[PDB]
């Protein structure tokens, strides 16, 4: 069982007649054998859930959910409720309504808080009332309906204080643009009910038009929105299939490595974030080799992305079964598979750059670059190309440093402009290491200055 909504309301006034039926609170079934046993909380609450006074005014019919003032709510009672309202103006009070004995948190579907408003005056003259306040609740109604639940009556349009205090005013209701939907309200009826069990294949929300006539005749209509919830029986999934193909290059480290993303969607836990966040599952084993050391599965964004932040290991191929279920090992599962196929140019090519004596440098003398095909091999994590020499007596030292940038560049300071003519042919050698291995063993560069 669950209430048609989590909060109700109606207008209360000073010194209303004892017994005044106020409203109905409704609850629909999950199984046809379910029958509610309505009850109330023992205290009336005010602004921000202020506990004001023992509920000696409002009572409920345990079968129909009818709320009424079992005792006349006079001015003094309002003032007593007012002074206990923690300094706030006493405009709305409420009480808790439950489906069964418990006492417990008023948490819908198992409860609703009936928020009664109040005016520091007696009931207004019926002749002064408009069809809006005669027909439909003060604020706009909002309904809550679940899927794969038996149909039944969920609301009565007619306001009970109007029938009770204004029985001379005739009001009747119906639905417009409701054809083909489970919602029905017979012509000139006071009640509204469903006809068939709701499911997700019908709608994810309803908004109908509710209309009434009063008396002289006046017609008024309001929106009739209904919140649809998601069936919780199974995980309809997935429109996407499985594709285990992938590839990894050895010594191609990234700060955030990705093997594959298989985007997923289901009708069960994707509609709401909480449905998956509260409970979710992913690949359990194998773990030790890859899943424990490097790679993880991102199932919570409905991506099924396998990615890694740590270092790589030897080319060990695998194919892991990914779990996409909500609850693993106690419910029907949905899984997919992804494989990793792990397979570094290490070019040794001495670029013979040409220099000039008395170079017209601004600050430094550029020699050249060390950018090679490895730039994509290690994916921007440079292997630290270092150019050195001990044979030539010219350009002894400069800024030929192991630049960390993807490309890498080498140059010397504009300090040997008059030393380069000492010798024409300068011999350099370049090496580079990374990932605890020798990447570029050696290349001997012939660089001239004349």
């Amino acid at each position: 069982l669950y209430f048609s909504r989590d909060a109700y309301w109606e207008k209360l006034y000073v010194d209303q007649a004892a017994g005044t039926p106020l409203l109905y609170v409704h609850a629909l079934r999950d199984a046809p054998e379910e029958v509610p046993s309505f009850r109330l909380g023992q205290h009336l609450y005010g602004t921000y859930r202020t506990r004001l006074h023992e509920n000696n005014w409002i009572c409920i019919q345990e079968d129909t959910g009818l709320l009424y003032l079992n005792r006349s709510l006079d001015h003094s009672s309002w003032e007593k409720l007012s002074v206990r309202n923690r300094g706030f103006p006493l405009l709305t009070v409420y009480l808790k309504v439950f489906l069964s004995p418990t006492e417990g948190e008023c948490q819908w579907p198992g409860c609703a808080r009936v928020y009664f408003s109040f005016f520091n005056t007696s009931f207004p003259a019926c002749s002064s009332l408009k069809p809006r306040e005669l027909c439909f609740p003060e604020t706009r109604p909002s309904f809550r309906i679940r899927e794969n639940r038996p149909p039944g009556t969920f609301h009565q349009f007619r306001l009970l204080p109007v029938q009770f205090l204004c029985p001379n005013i005739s009001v009747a209701y119906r639905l417009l643009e409701g054809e083909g939907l489970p919602f029905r309200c017979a012509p000139d009826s006071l009640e509204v009910s469903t006809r068939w069990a709701l499911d997700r294949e019908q709608r994810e929300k309803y908004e109908l038009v509710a209309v009434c006539t009063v008396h002289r005749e006046e017609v008024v209509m309001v929106p009739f929105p209904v919140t649809v919830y998601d069936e919780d029986d199974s995980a309809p999934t997935f429109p996407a299939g499985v594709d285990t193909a992938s590839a990894v290059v050895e010594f191609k480290r990234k700060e955030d490595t990705v093997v594959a993303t298989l985007r997923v969607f289901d009708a069960d836990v994707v509609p709401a974030s909480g449905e998956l966040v509260r409970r979710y599952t992913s690949t359990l084993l194998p773990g030790d080799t890859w899943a424990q050391q490097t790679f993880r599965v991102e199932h919570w964004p409905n991506e099924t992305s396998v990615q890694a932040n740590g270092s790589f290991v030897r080319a060990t191929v695998h194919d892991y079964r990914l779990v996409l279920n909500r609850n693993l090992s106690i419910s029907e599962n949905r899984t997919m598979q992804l494989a990793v196929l792990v397979n570094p140019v290490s070019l040794h090519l001495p670029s013979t750059y040409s220099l000039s004596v008395s170079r017209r440098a601004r600050r430094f003398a550029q020699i050249g670059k060390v950018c090679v095909e490895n730039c994509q091999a290690f994916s921007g994590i440079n292997v630290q190309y270092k150019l050195h020499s001990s044979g030539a007596n010219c350009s002894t030292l400069g800024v030929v440093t192991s630049a960390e940038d993807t490309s890498g560049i080498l140059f010397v300071n504009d300090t040997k402009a008059l030393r380069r003519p000492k010798c024409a042919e300068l011999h350099y050698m370049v090496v580079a290491t990374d990932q605890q291995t020798s990447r570029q063993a050696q290349a001997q560069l012939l660089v001239t200055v004349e």
Binding site: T47, Y48, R49, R86, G87, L91, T139, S142, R144, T227, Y229, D230, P271, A272, S273, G274, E275
Partner: protein
């Protein structure tokens, strides 16, 4: 204030013992009694104010005696200022790119200009090639801006009117959306509210927001006692926290504001997500209050 209101009875064995009892939460029986005993303390039903000295402790102390919801209480709200809020409307009534004139008025005010520049220079600070700013420090920067800068510059600039999109964007750019408001992602407003709820200042000023900005129907302007500024003040208080609202676009007059979030992934809670988010965009109080104020009302 709430800090002193605790001290007035904190020395008492009653408040001392029962304060600790609620901190624990049978215990539930004693915690319920602790509420009833502390209910008579000066701390209980105390009030704080925006920009209060120890504005954090005035709420941590008060909240610590909450017994344990969609709309929270606003003990932070400077209730007595509600009259002053009406007076501020009288002021702006007396005192073209109107947002620019508001900015120029600040630039000529040594206090506002200094504070304004002192915090923009934080929110416009580049951190890295792929990080526009330190949004947290910016939020802290703006958080102080809206309490230390006088109302007659803070609100004049924040709720300035416009005639074109150049002004309207200037209005949107008031607090550097590219730093304080915009981001790579728009989290779920319901989760974002849940995060805000855990912070005393954000949660309480959020309570202040719908305390004066709830889309009410009993009043004419959906504002308490049709008070435009009461909403506008509580609204501005939210700038500099996780729930920082901002203008949606640069419409010359179509003023719409909201935090930096959406309702994707709410499912069963889509109503509650919108129920709160609607208070920013579908709220006649903010709509009339921001326009009326900016227009000199």
């Amino acid at each position: 204030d709430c800090v002193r209101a605790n001290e007035l009875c904190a020395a008492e064995s009653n408040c001392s013992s029962r304060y600790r009892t609620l901190r624990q939460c049978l215990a539930n029986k004693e915690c319920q009694a602790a509420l009833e005993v502390l209910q008579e303390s000066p701390l209980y039903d105390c009030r704080c104010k925006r920009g209060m000295k120890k504005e954090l402790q005035c709420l941590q102390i008060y909240w610590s005696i909450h017994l344990g919801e969609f709309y929270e209480a606003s003990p932070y709200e400077p209730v007595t200022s509600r009259l002053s809020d009406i007076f501020r409307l009288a002021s702006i009534f007396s005192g073209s790119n109107h947002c620019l004139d508001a900015a120029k008025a600040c630039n000529l005010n040594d206090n506002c200009k200094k504070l304004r520049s002192s915090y923009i220079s934080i929110c416009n600070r580049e951190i890295s090639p792929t990080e526009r700013c330190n949004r947290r420090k910016c939020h802290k920067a703006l958080r102080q801006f809206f309490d230390r800068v006088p109302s007659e510059y803070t609100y004049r600039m924040l709720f300035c009117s416009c005639q074109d999109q150049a002004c309207a964007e200037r209005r949107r750019q008031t607090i550097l959306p590219s730093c304080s408001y915009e981001d790579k992602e728009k989290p779920n407003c319901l989760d974002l509210r849940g995060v805000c709820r855990t912070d005393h200042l954000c949660r309480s000023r959020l309570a202040d927001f719908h305390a004066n900005c709830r889309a009410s129907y009993q009043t004419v302007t959906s504002c308490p006692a049709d008070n435009y500024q009461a909403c506008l003040g509580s609204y501005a208080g939210m700038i500099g926290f996780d729930m920082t609202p901002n203008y949606v676009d640069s419409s010359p007059t179509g003023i719409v504001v909201s935090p930096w979030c959406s309702c994707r992934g709410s499912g069963n809670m889509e109503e509650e997500c919108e129920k709160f988010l609607r208070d920013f965009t579908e709220n006649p109080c903010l709509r009339n209050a921001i326009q009326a104020f900016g227009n000199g009302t």
